[model samples]
Target: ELKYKIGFPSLYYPKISLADRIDAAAEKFGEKTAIISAEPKFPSEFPESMNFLEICEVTKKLASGISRKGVRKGEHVGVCIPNSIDYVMTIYALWRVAATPVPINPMYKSFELEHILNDSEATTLVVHSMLYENFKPVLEKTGVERVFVVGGEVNSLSEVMDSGSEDFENVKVNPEEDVALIPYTGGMPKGVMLTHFNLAANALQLAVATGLSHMDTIVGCMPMFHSAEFGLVNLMVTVGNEYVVMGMFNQEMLAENIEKYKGTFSWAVPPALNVLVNTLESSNKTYDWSYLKVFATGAWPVAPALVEKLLKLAAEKCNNPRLRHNQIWGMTEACPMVTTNPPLRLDKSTTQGVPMSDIELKVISLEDGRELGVGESGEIVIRGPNIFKGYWKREKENQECWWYDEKGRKFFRTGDVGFIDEEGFLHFQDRVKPFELEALLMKHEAVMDVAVIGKPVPKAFIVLKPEYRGKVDEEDIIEWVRERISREVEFVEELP
Candidate 1:
């Protein structure tokens, strides 16, 4: 039997909340450095380093202060802060108080921010000062009652941490039923509700899949708003490993941090890694990447050319050729991990690897719901404990998104289209609907008609209205689309 078919041993998912899991890590790895922010742009009060015990202590006090304010248990709180030590503490503190955290991208504009706020019904918000300043009118329009800004003159996060003592007790929670996070997923703006059990279960499953250990130090370079990043945080803490945090994606800075801090594994998106390789190609100097073992990318499709180039560069820099690439396949709905190419066993390529331990993955026919045979491409369906509970307030979609097998196991119909190979590896193809992109481009004022086609990367073919012809250029349309989606565009006289 194939190793992928046999899978790993099943794990016991503890019913404790993530907040409790961190405390356990503190007890086990007290003096170990739990988190480090090597990025230079962090807020002045942000800690450059902290041990596991220190993280637990600070979060406890912060939780008390948050409860001391009017924010109660079961409240849906908005967190629109960039990645930092402060951001991590805020999320953990909210969990200690049993309030669900709804993290939104700090870079989103007014309308985008308004949509999430309205959908989540978040009365209290913890935001960065710049976002609070830019979206003040939107927050007011959405009826956000209380705003706590980080690095701001009024209602600052530091002040919230200073107001209360560390004596606050953690609220007991039913991990299976209590909602811990409400992350926005897919092409739509609906909130995906994930319970504490879902988060903990996924962490345990990923720990087994990736062979994570306490000796490993992870470089967290991705945006923390995404489920993958947050899930990594939970996994790292649970495994008693150290996490090195960075602000935003700066290729040179990230390279320096990985080599300087001795990163064992690092997480990033495709574009960031592409730029890193390009940056290395132009530079005359090469740093020693001997310690950086695995460079993983997800959240977008990774090109085979990029992976080959990255491995070649690492081989040249390290001389030992120990560096490998891990291309992960995930979405927000599956707690961000469905399949991951484990660096040890899997050869570096574009395939999404095998299903994770305890994850039942299959393909279903697009025309009907019948299961497809191996190598038959269709919509991917996943049944696992890491799957999200449901979309918050989206009852109809919640019902439509699920399928049941003969054993009565619930499966999430991932809009993604892919097929399982004979060797048990899954290769991703495309999504069920291409209109999601066409619809976004149709919102542009200049374009009369647009069509998106897949050519390795998505390219747009446009037919502008006659009145706007020659008035708008390809760059204008590309920039408009970039604000909403990241892809390529071309201006054509007519759609083929």
Candidate 2:
């Protein structure tokens, strides 16, 4: 019920670009733990980071080396890697040189990977060693010329890290307007062109939204390829907080991490949250989650019943009752955060909290050309620097969704249909053209048809191809789909 306001709006933010924010943090938090990896999956070369200064140093070298390999400003450089320190370095490197990092899902097979590379027109890529073979079949088809694989036989990224200087010249960057990361939607191939301002503003705004301080220890387990993780990780970095990094999530690891890192706050989807909750319930072991002040869940609907469960469990496991469950709202198009419930939900409600600073949202009626009042559901339209500029080269579609007022205002249409309650909180109802789940299922070769229904949870009804019907079991499909996206999926023999 309270208003949302950042400590400082974009106008007052000292860092002009996202990269600049890292530079400032590097100087300010020089001796703190910037990033740490406990997972043995990371090779010998990557170590736990001591400070932001180390990140800035390595990022500069990677940028200079990439520059030497013909990657210039404003070009799309694909980063097809998992959630590791290397992925984070590649992102910082691309931003340093003003080259856009096109985050490609490392789990994608050759066909889907090729489509994304060609669609983004990315000629250069920074990928993982184990995933190099997947790219090899698609490299020729995708027209990717240069590939820097981490832990590969080629050893190009190693050479770059060994040779390049940390004093690389500053490439001019337009903070408000220049495109930065280009991450494709989970269910769609369309690449969202988030400008440098869009990302920096969102991260800073989220820091303001969550009241994230420099002393906070945020858990970093989400995959780097995910757009939200792109924002989440950067939010921690820009604020000069520490992250307990992991290559991938495991139920046991989730509990061990909370106990080990003493993570002050963390983020995850509902199913993943279930794993952690169940792990605590099933095991006789006890976890010290008291340091976990706030636990946020979003990207999918989380039942209130489960929310109550987490709240109770958090209080039982943790030493304090101050732990909170923040329900994040918005989509990839909104730079990933429109509204989020605060710590302790400071003001608890069934609806998503008020819009962040510099953001304006409205509910437009589907039948009439007017704003919808409380209880009147309609499509949500928003205008803000936090909203992305547009989808990559899809101006025709972008123009269709944009709205302007009589006095020259700009708004982007979020196909999500929802209502604004009398209290000003958003009641997100149903998705207009839900590409998130159906799109993910379509990517699998065995899935010929797919349909999703979301109520208490998402149930996926999928029809497999004729040949792969008996060969692939439901558990196989469920586990396979979990790799790309996390959700409760159902295997059906028929679909519409």
Candidate 3:
């Protein structure tokens, strides 16, 4: 028997579940706002807005519907939907029934969808009506046994709530033992399974790091399917904070919604933040943004110059006396958060801040396996309660990625290379492995994103985005790289 260990012991430790958390939130903050979903054509709209109390009621009924369809405890159910109210409800409802919700990227075509559906062996799939047609072609070839379409007139989860009973029947579950979410992993055949215990511990760590309280109003602009948004947005709900959900990124709408809803904080990627800054700077129209508190960005490298520019712009436009900027660093396997730059320390542009509570991080030299001190660059290793139990059913991959430390704590090699400063701030370096170096080389200014793999001659395969499509020749790219690294490396236009 493998016993999972988190740092703290609380009601959430041995038998805690997300459903229980939702119930607690509903009971204590029943009338408080929960999710506000926005669509196009309206600056802000929450057609399926819910108070905490209503959220529980709806989730219970939806859970009943899920149960009626034979979803049982410990079963995996695939949830393929956009960032809509249905997406949120479906997740809660599945957990309520003690079923693990496997989030599938809705953008997946037939081939990709089939692979995930079969990989998880999810018997039931809950998706939106808009996406039903897309999945219909692949369902026949997959393992999904049932399909429930959301946002329809009759079968919709929202409608099912109004037409059905709201009895909150607890599913029989050992909360700590049940898997809650199986996050899909790209570039791999297997999924990453996260138990309820995994999520609870990560949420607790995040709550402490972010200072999340009932007073905060968080924005959910990133896709709900992503682990970062799940940890932040879903965890916000657990902690009794109001949140607004955006299905997709839109700059003008986001700006208007923030002002209209008095959003205290927002989480975004660099591209998304770029959108916000560019929109504000380029727009002729202006809006009051005094209520904004913090703007957090992550999931990609943010140049220090961009960070400073955005912070300056936000401060100037919001005119708020206490605005702050922050960024977080983590990947899906670590429950999407390993470190967070403190909101107040936005001026420290280069660092990704310190490790969150209960997370132990170290930089180690790849050559001699010696742990490096501050300011020494090496591969980053992490041991934390938030790390995944293992890659779902991939014994070899799991064994390769996870290892036990001297203290018997399991550590996951992040593969990324970085060093911590004396101040405990983490500064990311290039990856220590060959693949990452090849990737870095491919992203040179002359070249767009490219894929590098083991081929006949370790060839660098390149592809340009539409903006640079057909504009530059291959030789021009090779010359640019040669000039940049004349001494240490060589570049040739033609393969030998």
Candidate 4:
């Protein structure tokens, strides 16, 4: 029988300090590929590449530049850019200077951008040239003190590199010092403040869980702004692994690159995996993927059927009888990874594998705060070094989401409901807050994405998403959701 290990004690230890983790890689893997930008639209194919040493060197220079611009320690520096080599450089540079790196989502419009800039109390803004126009008007409206544009008409990294001043002295920093990464929490005003320690600890934990080695070649496609990819990709560099960055995700080009570069492993999302599964099944053409070892998908819950489909396709296409399916469970507040399915354990594919080393997971009954027995579904709670100290500038919000158990262990309530099986694999259920269900009731079909949150309403609340640009009416959407819930789940009230 599979022994249930819910709330099992973690065995992983944080190997090195966060800053030292990067420093060690810079010293040991100086010549290794840190980032490669391959964008088809650009004139130069595979236009930019940076080694680990170069990455460190350039970031130090950028940090000096930022300091020269009056960026003080502990200040928030907004970074709004696409996935590029400069993005990596800017983040490390921010860390080197002891400033918080506030990552802005490129998808935001002028109103949204202005709000984040002001909300984060970010004094300086570093953005891509392409997005400058979007924020130009808002800059004047907001209090952002300094603005630097990357990769365009002015002040590009090329300009910085060509100036022949690559020597920027590194600023002193405490390894445990806070380095906030502004993560979007739907409509929440405050962003998550993940510290240097949070990121480094998570990286070490993942390295231990996956048995990451120096020889592994990490493929980067997920946005750098995302916590999951940030931890995974950085962990690759920490272990002296070669990394290939995809500026934008394209299946055909990605497949070709894998064949060309002999990439061993890649981290992807559900949509990307879907594309690969379709590409492998296509009858028109074929590509050799013999070099590929493991493809792990995360950030979103992939349907069990999709997981099964991907495993079958990978096994057949790679012609490797040894391919494995893996998924990780994490949140932005957890510095991304809380648990990962061990590569050796294929049976956990249906669940989000056991908690990572140094991380403890518990399933507690929402009704009484009683710890649920294994196999009993409840709220998923995590206690680990990776947990963020708190939401930036929002103490009450932090208290609402984070809690401590009777054992004096600090635990971050995921707000997500799930359960652990006998083998310690997690199976997600739903949200604990009733507000989520109310929001679902009001959702419109035209909405591409919808998030439900409870409000003052007894049985209904807000179903928020991008406004429908199509001809779909709100009444029709409400009717559809009414029917959907009626069939799937019994609700207390009918839509008005």
Candidate 5:
């Protein structure tokens, strides 16, 4: 099989657990501000933030407390909360106790929640009070034995912190075998089992790919439960940088915060960037965005027009000609950082720059399974330490997704269709899973049958149940799907 090897030298990934890595970061950058939340909550005054030492201090106590509550080593714990200081501490606490974390989207409804909670077999859950109130019945159906609410009632976060000892030794974990995170992905929601070593390696790889430094104050608007957010958090802790966390993503606020907090680099999806560009353009006032060096977009392929428009706007309105639009691409199976566009090798025309450090990339024919050479379109496959061990307990899927090279190195199928150009840039074509959406749509009672097609954007043709044809309109169906999933949706009637 042909391959596009990495241009940069391989990185030295430390064998330490992520909890130990955080302890090391505290020792180096203790007094410096490590995290700043836009929405203030818990254990802080006017400016809601925590220094490195504070993070270490709080998480250790929390770890001891949770352990005392019977959360033992090697257990899987569910974390269903939005982005906040409490969410961060909960994750660190679980890792400190040698337990794995399963980060679930706080907005997940019954079907989504039940699948993840039951599939991961998480016994204990850490959730926000509001979410606990909403998902109480769904929790009853899962294997979760305890729900530690972040606020309200007994068995809360404060109670957990207050009941435990400050002096505690973290349990020993084998980084290579010990699982760190099991975040759900795919429209059907399969758990990707990412080990501690996988996360640590990806952190170092991304740090190299993005030129991460302590001097950079990063704006983090990605949902805390996302795989990309996990990668960013690992990178921040490893590099000792300040992370400005956004509990919610507001396009206008992102623009203002870029100026307010002087954020050097920020994470956002394509839709958010599109809205931000519209927000800035429509506003009468001029905001300075000179401090922002890179606005990294991920989770979806971005349009070149959007990148060009934003760069032109920054140069014309914000007076910063140095702004670069970095397109990042990866899935949860790859520990989510297969390719990234660093400023040093940025090509605005390409969808993504290069494979991350030590990552091997190749495109293979979907029909014959033969590897395609440069500039040929096919399914993108990759091999790296950052690639996840496998989907949790999904033996058949694990067997199906990997293709071994002549050297016996296994390359995981990315499902996404893309190709490597002459300059080693990966160009995204389309994803190969409309059946995933059709399956999701079939769950709705009113839909008798559905077929989804991706003409760049997803559109669904629905054959409604005979009795309810006139009862529900296209608007109602669109709203129902939108409430469950976030995507650009177009609905069409089934032809006779």
Candidate 6:
């Protein structure tokens, strides 16, 4: 059987900054609808109808304004804000000025925010007014000298722009060399510095691989700080697509907006989708969903069963099952995506689908570092233009990030275990270590020993100390770990 393709044979990524993509969009689309923001109960300061022409001009002004505050080229500008129009605009502004946008979670308190700000060597921060209180005391600790307030009594953009010049020129970035973003790999103190070229390539790769058109408006309900959100935002801006963005995910608001806007496609994580499924199934009052197309998801390993049900519901009164439940796979290191389950087919929900045209993935020996054949489980390693440059200011550790084959091809060790089939689909097996969630869990006072394994679902195994054994019950341990990580927790009497 010959293979059916949903994307290009190979994508030739343009060596352009994300800011350049905005300029292109403004030129081509001009006054056409580029952004459609919903009206809130409280009147929004931002306009409802925003075009590319406005986007290009406003971003330029913001860029010039930010630059006036000494956020020069190659400097790190921290955006500790939520997913608002302001959040996206600020990121674009920094990119236009050739400054790396370091997005920190608005939820981050003094402890986590300080680590990120100091590690990124951030001198300036654009923070949400409500959240600025959390950073005020720690401003000195985080090495943040300049703070611009948004949505507060204090001025944020108004002050910046009141003194800003719209005549500021966008920097000539060496896309291949100049870093675009310092996205922390899941909020780790260490950041994976993704270059402009890396972001452009990943956006192109995603645009091609997913076959999502520019006409579709993507719903942005996830945290802006996440790697997936970072990539999706760039992809939208790159392709000239509009985003119905939100500050955070509220299941009710997400559903209402998708239904309201007639969204052709949307993205989600496994846990978020699970909540939606439970809610939709329980609601029982069938509303119109004929407009919804692709249901894309994946951050953690997705349950095949969940995918099947989502596909079923989406196709029941929808486009004859054409609305696919696509499971995408990528890490922060790979600019947030390398493969998305082909939209043209639904035969393989169990796999992460074929690698994108640009991605070259292979399974290698865990111990011997030998390349494994098809169908053999081994550590998954990948090499692509979509991959990140390296850790920020950690050049010494970057040297250890790659494994070269006999043919001199370099591969980024994913620390994940998986295999590819003869048909070329990648099957995720396990990770060599669960350092991300494990590290977060270890920070808990009750968690003396903890390990998280993500198979179909992420399950945490914890070993409590003798003192906290009776004091901290199963629910207590689960809730304590739950406050940090989003997964199920299981307590073990004995440690491994």
lDDT by residue for model 5 over 1-496, one digit each (tens)? 3344346568888787889977888899989998888742333211388888888888888999999999988888999888777788899989899899999888776556676788899999988877765567567888888789887577887788888888867889999899989988855568888898898898888888888888888888778788887678766578998888777788777777778888898877889888888987888778788899888888888877888999999898886898887877888987888888656667643467788889998899998989998889999999998999888878888898988889899999988898877767888889988675676678888888888887757788998888777888878877776655535356655532
By summed lDDT, which 10 consecutive residues of candidate 1 come out lowest?
A: 487-496
lDDT of 4 at 218: 69
The candidate with the higher lDDT, 1 or 4, is 1
Better of 2 and 5 by lDDT: 5
Top lDDT: which candidate number? 5
Write the residue-wise lDDT of candidate 3 on 1-496 in tens digits: 1132222222334357778888888888888888777654222112557888877877888888777767888888999888776777788888888889899887765545666788788888888777777678669988778777776654666555655458857676665566889997644446887877778778887877777778877767787898888787776456788888777878888887887788888878888888788887877766666767677888867877776777677666655546677778887788778887665565654568777777888887778877788788888888877788777878798887754567787778887888877666789876555353354456565455565555433445665655665577676765554433212123333221
Q: What is the C-alpha lDDT of each candidate?
A: 0.80, 0.75, 0.73, 0.69, 0.81, 0.75
Flag clash pairs in model 1.
none
Please give, for residues 1-496, the per-residue lDDT of candidate 6 as tens digits: 1144343367788888779888888898787777666533222335665888887888888888878878889988898777777777788888899998898877776556767888899988988877777677568876777777766555577667666777767899999899999888662357889999888888888888877667877777777778787677666667777777765677667777777777777878999988877776676445455677777788877887897777776566333366667778989999878776675555776678877877888888877988888788888889889888889878777897688988898899887888877666788887776565576667768778877887655666778776776776667755655544333355433353
Clashes (backbone N, CA, C under 3 Å), per candidate, total 0, 0, 0, 1, 0, 0
Pitting candidate 1 against candidate 5, the one with the higher lDDT is 5
lDDT of 4 by residue, 422-441 (tens): 77788887776543333444
Model 6 lDDT at residue 438: 73
My TM-score estimates for the predictions, one after another, are 0.87, 0.85, 0.82, 0.81, 0.87, 0.84
Which residue pairs overlap in candidate 3's backbone? none
Clashes of 6: 0
Residue 309 alpha-carbon offset, candidate 2, angstroms: 0.9
The residue-by-residue lDDT of candidate 2 on 1-496, one tens digit each, is 3243322233344446677766778888887888888663465246765478888788888788888878889989988877787888888888888999889887776556777888899978888888877777658877677888887767557677776777886578887788998887764458889888888778877887777888788886667688777677886567888877778877677767877888988878889888777776677766688788778777876777777777777677645466777767777887888786544444553467767767788888888748777778898998877788789977777778777766789887888898876556777888887355677778878888888887555667778788786787768866665554535365534432
TM-score-superior candidate, 3 or 6? 6
Where is model 1 more than 4 Å wrong at Cα? Answer: 1-6, 318-320, 434-496
